[PDB]
């Protein structure tokens, strides 16, 4: 996260860290959607251009975390993956269309003050909240700059941007399965997700029922926090039928 701030304790209790066993490192962000399911970006697990093809045994999910590097004894819970499910129409060749994956945990995680699932939006939540100007919140332990690393979880609030402005900012083809967010150069304010924030959640707090909903997944960009550029996010509601099918089994 570039130009964000340190998270408060328990601010994002659905925040998940995808952690590589060997070498011991940050693989990606992710989110907790139930006691047994974790949502992430497909590119966190499958990305042929960079020879990335992780299997269940390659990683661990660390839940309830705040510090990036420390082992948070009596706070964080470490879970193993039973199975990974990548969207069958995930487009890693061109624009990361349908950049979404599910991970089933081997055992259910216990909820606590620091561990709690986020909601997934229904049609009405998405129609009411996914509007240009409406702000969401992105969290992660990724890069503080495009070209170090944070000590604790970072947070940034960013406005959803008009589809024509998203389209006009890039040469990459944009689809209905993604949306873009961030400030314009005229807005003064800054902020973006960056490398290492991938797979993390873009959340909004419904003013109707006061619950947090995951509207997006950190997916891609072209550099980080550049003027005239915006961060791109997987549109969660657009892919909810796939999510529901996988969880129903």
């Amino acid at each position: 996260i570039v130009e964000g701030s340190d998270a408060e304790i328990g601010m994002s209790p659905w925040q998940v860290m995808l952690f590589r066993k060997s070498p011991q490192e940050l693989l990606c962000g992710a989110s907790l959607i139930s006691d047994r399911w974790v949502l992430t970006a497909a590119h966190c697990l499958l990305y042929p251009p960079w020879d990335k093809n992780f299997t269940e045994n390659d990683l661990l999910v660390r839940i309830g975390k705040h510090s990036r590097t420390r082992y948070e004894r009596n706070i964080e819970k470490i879970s193993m993956l039973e199975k990974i499910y990548i969207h069958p129409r995930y487009n890693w060749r061109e624009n990361l269309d349908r950049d979404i994956a599910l991970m089933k945990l081997k055992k259910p995680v216990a909820f606590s003050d620091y561990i709690h699932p986020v909601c997934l939006p229904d049609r009405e939540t998405a129609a009411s909240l996914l509007q240009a100007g409406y702000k969401g919140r992105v969290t992660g332990w990724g890069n503080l700059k495009e070209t170090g690393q944070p000590s604790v979880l970072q947070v940034v609030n960013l406005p959803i941007v008009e589809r024509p402005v998203c389209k006009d900012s890039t040469r990459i083809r944009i689809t209905d399965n993604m949306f873009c967010a961030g400030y314009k150069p005229d807005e003064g304010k800054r902020g973006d997700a960056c490398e290492g924030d991938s797979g993390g959640p873009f959340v909004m707090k419904s003013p109707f029922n006061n619950r947090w909903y995951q509207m997006g997944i950190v997916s891609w960009g072209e550099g980080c926090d550049r003027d005239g550029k915006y961060g791109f996010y997987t549109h969660v509601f657009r892919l909810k039928k796939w999510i529901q099918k996988v969880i129903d089994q």
Binding site: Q24, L60, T69, Y71, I78, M80, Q149
Partner: peptide, 10 residues
């Protein structure tokens, strides 16, 4: 620069 996690997690 990551702190070692308990052995039980593999």
């Amino acid at each position: 620069d990551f702190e070692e996690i308990p052995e039980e997690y593999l």
